[PDB]
Amino acid sequence: TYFVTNGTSTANKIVVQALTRPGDIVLIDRNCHKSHHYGLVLAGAYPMYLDAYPLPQYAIYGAVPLRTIKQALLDLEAAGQLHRVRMLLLTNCTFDGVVYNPRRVMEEVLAIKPDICFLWDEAWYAFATAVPWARQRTAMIAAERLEQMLSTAEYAEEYRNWCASMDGVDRSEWVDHRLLPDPNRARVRVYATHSTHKSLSALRQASMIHVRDQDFKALTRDAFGEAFLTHTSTSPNQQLLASLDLARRQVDIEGFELVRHVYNMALVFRHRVRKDRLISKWFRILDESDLVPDAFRSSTVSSYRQVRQGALADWNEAWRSDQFVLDPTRLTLFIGATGMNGYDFREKILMERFGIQINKTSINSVLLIFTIGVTWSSVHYLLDVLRRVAIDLDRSQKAASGADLALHRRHVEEITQDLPHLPDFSEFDLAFRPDDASSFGDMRSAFYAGYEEADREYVQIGLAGRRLAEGKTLVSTTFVVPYPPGFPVLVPGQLVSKEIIYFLAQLDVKEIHGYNPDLGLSVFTQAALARMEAARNAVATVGAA
Amino acid sequence: TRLDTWNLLDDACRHLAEVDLAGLDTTHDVARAKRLMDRIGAYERYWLYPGAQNLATFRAHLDSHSTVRLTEEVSLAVRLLSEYGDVLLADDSPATAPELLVVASIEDAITAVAAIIRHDVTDLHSTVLAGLRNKAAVTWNANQTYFVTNGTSTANKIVVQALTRPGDIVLIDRNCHKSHHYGLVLAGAYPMYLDAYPLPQYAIYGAVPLRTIKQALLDLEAAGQLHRVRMLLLTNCTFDGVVYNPRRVMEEVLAIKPDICFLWDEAWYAFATAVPWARQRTAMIAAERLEQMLSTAEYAEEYRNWCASMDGVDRSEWVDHRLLPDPNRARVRVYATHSTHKSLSALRQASMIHVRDQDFKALTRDAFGEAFLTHTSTSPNQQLLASLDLARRQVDIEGFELVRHVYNMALVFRHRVRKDRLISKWFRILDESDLVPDAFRSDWNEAWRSDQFVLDPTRLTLFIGATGMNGYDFREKILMERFGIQINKTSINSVLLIFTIGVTWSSVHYLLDVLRRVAIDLDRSQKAASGADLALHRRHVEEITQDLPHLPDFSEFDLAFRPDDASSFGDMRSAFYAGYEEADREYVQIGLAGRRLAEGKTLVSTTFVVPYPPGFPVLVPGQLVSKEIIYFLAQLDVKEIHGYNPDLGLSVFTQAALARMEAARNAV
Amino acid sequence: VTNGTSTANKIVVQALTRPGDIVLIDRNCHKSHHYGLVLAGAYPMYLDAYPLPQYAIYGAVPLRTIKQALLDLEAAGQLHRVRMLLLTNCTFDGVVYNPRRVMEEVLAIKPDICFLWDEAWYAFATAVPWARQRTAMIAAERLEQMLSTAEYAEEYRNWCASMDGVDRSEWVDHRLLPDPNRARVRVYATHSTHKSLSALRQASMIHVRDQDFKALTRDAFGEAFLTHTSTSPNQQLLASLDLARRQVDIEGFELVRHVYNMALVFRHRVRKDRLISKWFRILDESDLVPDAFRSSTVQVRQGALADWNEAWRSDQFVLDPTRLTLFIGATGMNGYDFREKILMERFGIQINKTSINSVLLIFTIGVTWSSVHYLLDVLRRVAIDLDRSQKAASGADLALHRRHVEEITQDLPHLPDFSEFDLAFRPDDASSFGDMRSAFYAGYEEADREYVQIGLAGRRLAEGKTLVSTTFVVPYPPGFPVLVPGQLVSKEIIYFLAQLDVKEIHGYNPDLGLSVFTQAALARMEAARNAVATVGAA
């Protein structure tokens, strides 16, 4: 552990620079916070974007299924490119609150690429110290358990029997099998970068780069220190920051009381929002049955008849063994029954800043982030707000009898019953793909090539569809980061596939980052793309002449 | 995992059709679907609900390339498996199903589905999983309550200091929380210890029978020192779980000393709130009813009749007769202390003190406030009240019906232990009749209030004597090393199960599973045992179960410490602090103690000996060591005793110091 | 320690002291300290701070006094009893003791005493340069290093030669060096880790620097730690936690430093602002420490590094830069009123104390450039309105203003110094320590207690029927116990008590009277004590 004074994105830039050099491929969860993509522009690495499983009924994105990661690695393996792959950047505890199972992810990824490094952005997973079984899903504990496992002889026997079980299966088919990391080759090179409690507060100061690296002392110590000083300062006291604080920093004992208080407040809120029948009539709190498709979990509520309430901890195996679970301190609230949009609800109904937060407003839901300021007063206030909303909705239902029942039904069906498509990642343009078969992009070159004011042009969203049908393909020159998704839907050099233009065309918000409806979507001119493709062909020739 | 493989096959059979409607080469999806069905079929024979005939039928759809049928079929099958995926019997029957299912496979037993087996039928259908079918904040309990910022130890010290002055005599339960003994050390009060009734069958103390309280009061009255006493400190409930009837003690004691204060340490009796009859046995409710009773004229007439009967009865005779407090003379002065909402992993302890004293406002209110300053410390300008409000809010999370829910689980667990008939063979839970003597034991609810003693349902003593091994051996070898159960006490032939709010259904079921599996190990050892091994098991049972040393009753305070020779109350404070002088105390080994006694040299303990840190002291400062106590110390397995260590002898006052302090007190 | 600071004091006191020990405790210390002394039977010898009548506040206790009291017990032959010197490293007003000197000279007299320092007020000493030296653990480190050196053994040899032939009674007039062989540094300290007030006000730590801890006190310390805080499965915190090189808080270093540079900016602006400084002043070592205790003699805010360092190294008393006493006497307005009305809205600065003519500004981690600018704005508005009303003054308004200034500046009342314990409770009639515990418990005997009106009490003293208080009396303005159980209510204490119109004083009520001992009860208790002192000695 190393204390970084300058926030989480600085820690990410430090570790990315310590681990990656230009032209390395990194696998990156596409929906991660935009600051991760700029770091890959800066490092000059090529992203291979992994696309999360969609939840269109909420217009939410989940995590990246581990089969997606295995397929994406084996695609490059068939291309012969896999040697390039240097990193697997994933965000643990994604903003939506889906939580990865890092132990299995590392096991199966290290089955394919025995020397990959893992970076986990854990800035959202702050309260895992409170929750009794959440700690094991932290990267730094999963890496410990995996390194212990890789050490034992019993595991060497288990792997012997596993590779005997797989014997005669093609490497291409390992996407369909449960893999184990070869204890001879796999090496645990895990990194995690979590925000401090002070940073959790709206002012952002400080972070910590946790390290569980087998090959730090040999391969990366120098690069890591160099990048540390590069991204902070080259002044006295930076070296002191470079000093470790792993067996130190026990001051959290006072902190532990606070994180456990916050967790107990989250439990109280969940139980009083589920029991209270005024609130429960309309409001709901999504759980693993709603936000995680059944394909990614073995725990099924209906299949075991001796059911238990579940307020109590009768589901300890889910944490240990499922792919995806929800962080209990990041509570999604479903307002679909009410009929109000999430943005409308957050902005008007409550405006609650005393404790808790609503960082994200979904089309039919509002996410509730329990911070370190929450108190009994704050949760009782929020519950009272919910209760008053429910009472006035019941009043409107009573009035609804006189021809307003159809308006309530219309609002509810429109927000919940009817949903738009979620646009998954297109592909990089040929101009910016170094290998014509693979999907990783030269996104840095597209970023810089996008500033050539003679190579860019503007197209209106109403014309883009016909331009695409005309074969005048569209390639974006810049990032585009709409507010509701909160992540880049387009990146430099990405093809604006029909689904993505259809997505952008719906947005009323004019102040989208990277795009402007009054000017148009910035795209490469056709001649510029032809020139870029010719340059790529020249490179692919001289590199093999 | 079987579900994972079926979901992968569902994905393959979906994409097969998604390609087929496009007209590209489906051969890849056909090959994938065939490989996936081949993988699934290695074990699908063992699960009834999806079936193996259905697997083969989907294979037949695959090779007939009827893609659009296969997609919908598999996506129905996998969703059915996801939501239902069928109680399941695990061997066949020819009977025409006279819920129930059958699978022909027996040995593999992979389904793990309440499974049953048949030979090479209601006796098996009668298997059942039933029973598992389930200020605005004040406790409403008393006229005053004061939330302490520290654990009950400190609420007890606060009340003791508030009411007790140096040179008072306090009647004190021998077996009470060590914090009370230290409170008496601080106050400079003289304890007079009431020994509880023994249970030699189990090597546990029960409770103080009311006759002992009356006898102690009358003994002090005969010595003429009764006026000095002003506190009957008795725990309500016990670690054992025997429950005092507070009203009976309060009335029959106020007959003799109509101005004594009562302190009831209720810390253990957390679950009294859960059930109403238990609520009646709580001290505060009893105090309110007693106060109401005294005021009424009708009670006064009842008292007049009792007094008429009492006339012609000497004071010594009173102990035999029931007594009723005089209405005019008696003052209710009842104090209680309760621990609040303790977390499984909390660094903070919170308590409350419940006061129902008529004289409190004038006699002790100032002292009570100063005691709070002396312990909690309050603030220069009081902000403690802000933290008092906070404590109530913490209760609100606790009050999710969790206490009742745990109480129901405890009853279910007891029922399961009796009901199974496999657990019953080697394990039972002690009945109220077992843990209460017939003399002290009398609608069930009426009987419960009427009885002098009852059992708290949530503190179940598991009896293990049929296992022939100690409670320490059982606890360590079976529970701790296997699962995390809430046991803490370990008796010679039993262990105590405490159903705190931290207990959850999964913990109950794992405890039941552990008991069942040990009953299987013992059944197989029984069938396997030779006559010699069975005789050895009989020896193990007879030793622990039958041959037990009687408990060490309190002996006396030394003549160095009793203020007068005609009574057993002692200057425990003086002994405690005098025991700090290292030149005045010597270490005598437990094996040497008996020789010292045989040599005619007395032994006196310098310090508390407390085998369970929150439990009760076996020895107290200034108490004479006696043979039974030596045996009790020797035979206990636990080496965690506070104020002692097995590496060292008992710290004993030296004969020169004993003679000095004896002669010094003779002048008073 | 997961409980407020007073619990840490309880733990260390119970771990080091036994009933009938003498504890040299400063009287100015907060009531919670004295109550702890009542517990455990300790006999306190009260040390009296040097007065500051012109502000009606008390400073530290001069080392002169500490040495004299220890020597006085030495002449009585009682010194063997002394087991502790309870002091507060930072006074509420701000006066910072120089611990290394207070421990060198004290260990010269009593080579094996234990020191307890309440440091709860000295929170920001780790921000201020040259402040950490005056803590108890750094003073203990430096003193232990010194005692180890051979060079110090030579210095001590020469010092003994200097004192050779001086009578040991005259040691109070000469500095003293602790004999290296006998001197045993056994320092303790306690503070609060930024505890939240009102709610969860439990943060505390016990700092231990004790050469004999492992041998003489480990067991007693652990037992006291469990007694005060309930025994629990989480017993790791008491035994072997040893977090000396742990709980690094780099962010907390940035927060204490932000708050210190905030105090610096406030203290500079309040001096350079031409409106504010006309009516307001912040007190300084020149004003709050009598020059007898500052060897250094004739800008501190600007520069001052390596020049004013000497004051920290060698002085007896200095001001904590964050405990800013704002003098308001030139405003002609009493502190209680100024705080109550002008500062009613309040802010992060605590302003939690109000003397007659001054208010104490206590900076806390909740401070920002906007709390500093708010307080400066308030000051400047008060100054502007005072200028306005001064310019509007007629000669009669000038007389009014000047007398409002005079009454809070010139004739301020005498501060009541500690009266000696009553004879009934002094175990040794030659010495002024008292059995304050037995006076506390003997005070609850409703037949031995009596009430006398403050006006009557002076008459009673004239008559000759001596007055002895049964209880603590803790008036709000000084904020410490002016009377304790068994203390003689000397004439000056009666006169002081008579001025206070606040009915709500702790331990006293003017509608009811001083809770004093009856004369016959005192005679009986004296006779009992003389009987004990006879049977205990022949």
Quote the minimal CA–CA distance from C230 to chain B in Å.
6
- Strands C114-118 and C82-88, bridge-based pairing: parallel
Total residue count of chain B as it appears in this document: 668
**Chains sharing 3 or more CB pairs under 8 A with chain A:** B, C
Which residues make Cβ contacts (< 8 Å) with residue B62, sequence separation at least 6? B30, B33, B34, B37, B70
Work out the widest C-alpha separation in chain A, in whole angstroms: 80
Tokens at A410, concatenated: 């219309």
Contact B505, A308 (CB under 8 A): yes
Contact A20, A85 (CB under 8 A): no
Residues in chain B that come right before a backbone break, where C and next N are over 2.5 Å apart: 86, 98, 113, 120, 134, 442
Work out the widest C-alpha separation in chain B, in whole angstroms: 116
H or E, element range at A425: none
**Cβ atoms within 10 A of the Cβ of C503, count?**
10
What residues form DSSP beta bridges with B229? B169
Are A306 and B129 within 8 A, CB to CB?
A: yes
Which residues make Cβ contacts (< 8 Å) with residue B425, sequence separation at least 6? B466, B519, B522, B523
Quote the minimal CA–CA distance from B153 to chain C in Å.
7
C344: phi then psi, degrees, rounded to nearest 5: -60, -40
Give burial (CB, 10 Å; 0-12/13-18/19+) of B314. Answer: exposed
Residues 235-254 of A with CB under 8 A from B: 253
Contact A258, A372 (CB under 8 A): yes
Tokens at B302, concatenated: 């009842």
Quote the minimal CA–CA distance from B81 to chain C in Å.
45
Contact B258, B325 (CB under 8 A): yes
Q: Where do the H-state alpha helices sit in B84-197?
A: 122-125, 152-163, 178-187
A56: phi then psi, degrees, rounded to nearest 5: -65, -30
Searching chain A, which residue's CA lies closest to the CA of residue C1? A254
| Distance, CA of B354 to CA of B372 (rounded, Å) | 14
Are B347 and A314 within 8 A, CB to CB?
A: no
Are B349 and C237 within 8 A, CB to CB?
A: no
Tokens at C538, concatenated: 């022949």
**Helices and strands, counts by H and E, chain B:** 26, 17
Contact A384, A450 (CB under 8 A): no
In three-state secondary structure terms, B382 is: coil
Cα A305 versus chain centre, distance:
35
Quote the minimal CA–CA distance from C481 to chain B in Å.
11
Which residues make Cβ contacts (< 8 Å) with residue C162, sequence separation at least 6? C174
Closest CA to C224 of C1, C56, C401, C65: C1
Searching chain A, which residue's CA lies closest to the CA of residue B99? A305
Best residue of A195, A203, A248, A377 to probe chain C, by most C CBs closer than 10 Å: A248
Distances (CA, A) of C257 to B579, C123, C321, C366: 50, 11, 12, 13
Tokens at A317, concatenated: 């195996």
Are B150 and C229 within 8 A, CB to CB?
A: yes
What residues form DSSP beta bridges with B234? B264
Quote the minimal CA–CA distance from B604 to chain C in Å.
21
Cα B102 versus chain centre, distance:
44
Taking contacts as CB-CB distances below 8 angstroms, the residues of chain A near C204 are none
| Distance, CA of C25 to CA of C104 (rounded, Å) | 18
Are B153 and C200 within 8 A, CB to CB?
A: no
Contact A248, A361 (CB under 8 A): no
Contact A385, A352 (CB under 8 A): yes
**Helices and strands, counts by H and E, chain A:** 20, 16
Searching chain C, which residue's CA lies closest to the CA of residue A238? C250
| Distance, CA of B76 to CA of A197 (rounded, Å) | 48
- Strands B428-429 and B459-463, bridge-based pairing: antiparallel
Closest CA to A375 of A388, A359, A356: A356
In three-state secondary structure terms, B383 is: coil
In three-state secondary structure terms, A84 is: helix
Closest CA to B375 of C40, C235, C85, C484: C40
Tokens at B432, concatenated: 């109220």
Only one residue has tokens 């006398």, namely C452
Only one residue has tokens 């020169």, namely B656
CA torsion C404-C408-C411-C417 (nearest 10°) is 160
In three-state secondary structure terms, C87 is: strand
Are B166 and C31 within 8 A, CB to CB?
A: no
Phi-psi region of B597 (alpha: psi -120 to 50; beta: other; left: phi over 0): alpha
> Which amino acid is residue C320, in one-letter code?
D
Contact A106, A157 (CB under 8 A): no
| Distance, CA of A175 to CA of A308 (rounded, Å) | 35
Could you say which DSSP state residue C509 is in?
A: B
Q: What's the first-to-final CA gap in chain C, in angstroms?
A: 46
Could you say which DSSP state residue A126 is in?
A: G
| Distance, CA of A323 to CA of A328 (rounded, Å) | 16
CA angle C474, C475, C481 (to 5 degrees): 30
Contact A86, A23 (CB under 8 A): no
Looking at the complex, does the CB of residue A313 fall below 8 Å from at least one CB of chain B? yes
Total residue count of chain A as it appears in this document: 545
Give burial (CB, 10 Å; 0-12/13-18/19+) of B657. Answer: buried
| Distance, CA of C188 to CA of C115 (rounded, Å) | 6
Nearest to B374 among C38, C232, C237 (CB): C38
> Which amino acid is residue B587, in one-letter code?
Y
Closest CA to B262 of B136, B389, B353, B132: B353
Q: What sign results for the dihedral spanned by CA atoms B63, B65, B66, B67? A: positive
Resolution stated for this PDB structure, in Å: 3.3
Best residue of C248, C256, C365 to probe chain A, by most A CBs closer than 10 Å: C248
Only one residue has tokens 């308001």, namely C328
Searching chain A, which residue's CA lies closest to the CA of residue C242? A250
| Distance, CA of B611 to CA of B638 (rounded, Å) | 7
Q: How many CB pairs under 8 A join A and B?
A: 49
Three-state secondary structure of B446-504: HHHHHCCEEECCCEEEEECHHHCCCHHHHHHHHHHCCCCCCEEEECCCEEEEECCCCCC
Taking contacts as CB-CB distances below 8 angstroms, the residues of chain A near C203 are 254
Quote the minimal CA–CA distance from B347 to chain C in Å.
7
Could you say which DSSP state residue B5 is in?
A: H
Which residues make Cβ contacts (< 8 Å) with residue B315, sequence separation at least 6? B218, B221, B222
Q: Which residues of C246-279 are buried (b: 16+ CB within 10 A; e: fewer)?
A: ebbbbbbeebbeebbebbbebbebbeeeebbeeb
Cα B590 versus chain centre, distance:
31
Taking contacts as CB-CB distances below 8 angstroms, the residues of chain A near B35 are 173, 176
Technique used by the depositors: cryo-EM
Closest CA to C268 of C415, C372, C423: C372
Contact B66, B32 (CB under 8 A): no
- Strands B204-205 and C281-282, bridge-based pairing: unpaired
Are C39 and B154 within 8 A, CB to CB?
A: no
Are B349 and C230 within 8 A, CB to CB?
A: yes
Cα C439 versus chain centre, distance:
23
Q: What's the first-to-final CA gap in chain B, in angstroms?
A: 84
| Distance, CA of C211 to CA of C185 (rounded, Å) | 6
Looking at the complex, does the CB of residue C18 fall below 8 Å from at least one CB of chain B? yes
Closest CA to A35 of A486, A530, A540, A338: A486
Quote the minimal CA–CA distance from C240 to chain A in Å.
14
DSSP labels for B137-160? Answer: SS---SSEEEEESS-HHHHHHHHH
Are B349 and C231 within 8 A, CB to CB?
A: no
H or E, element range at B173: strand B169-173
Are C441 and B390 within 8 A, CB to CB?
A: no
| Distance, CA of B172 to CA of B191 (rounded, Å) | 6
Taking contacts as CB-CB distances below 8 angstroms, the residues of chain A near C237 are 253
| Distance, CA of B452 to CA of B435 (rounded, Å) | 13
| Distance, CA of C175 to CA of A49 (rounded, Å) | 77
Are A247 and C246 within 8 A, CB to CB?
A: yes
Which residues make Cβ contacts (< 8 Å) with residue B351, sequence separation at least 6? B147, B148, B150, B151, B152, B154, B155, B267, B337, B338, B339, B340
Contact A522, A450 (CB under 8 A): yes
**Helices and strands, counts by H and E, chain C:** 18, 16
H or E, element range at B100: none
Work out the widest C-alpha separation in chain C, in whole angstroms: 80
**Cβ atoms within 10 A of the Cβ of A465, count?**
14
Are C250 and A3 within 8 A, CB to CB?
A: yes
Searching chain B, which residue's CA lies closest to the CA of residue A294? B82
Looking at the complex, does the CB of residue B577 fall below 8 Å from at least one CB of chain C? yes
Residue C131 exposure: Cα atoms within 13 Å on the Cβ side = 22
Which residues make Cβ contacts (< 8 Å) with residue A448, sequence separation at least 6? none
A212: phi then psi, degrees, rounded to nearest 5: -130, 70
Only one residue has tokens 């040390």, namely C47
Could you say which DSSP state residue A422 is in?
A: P
Phi-psi region of B305 (alpha: psi -120 to 50; beta: other; left: phi over 0): alpha
Closest CA to B385 of B223, B576, B147: B147
Are A251 and C250 within 8 A, CB to CB?
A: no
DSSP labels for C342-409? Answer: ITTT--SS---EE-SSEEEEE--TT--HHHHHHHHHHHHHHHHHHHHHHHT--HHHHHHHHHHHHHTT
A272: phi then psi, degrees, rounded to nearest 5: -85, -20
Taking contacts as CB-CB distances below 8 angstroms, the residues of chain C near B349 are 229-230, 232
In three-state secondary structure terms, A284 is: strand
Closest CA to A315 of A133, A141, A139: A133
H or E, element range at A333: strand A330-334
| Distance, CA of C477 to CA of C125 (rounded, Å) | 27
Looking at the complex, does the CB of residue C203 fall below 8 Å from at least one CB of chain A? yes
B377: phi then psi, degrees, rounded to nearest 5: 90, -10
Tokens at A508, concatenated: 């009323």
| Distance, CA of C161 to CA of C177 (rounded, Å) | 12
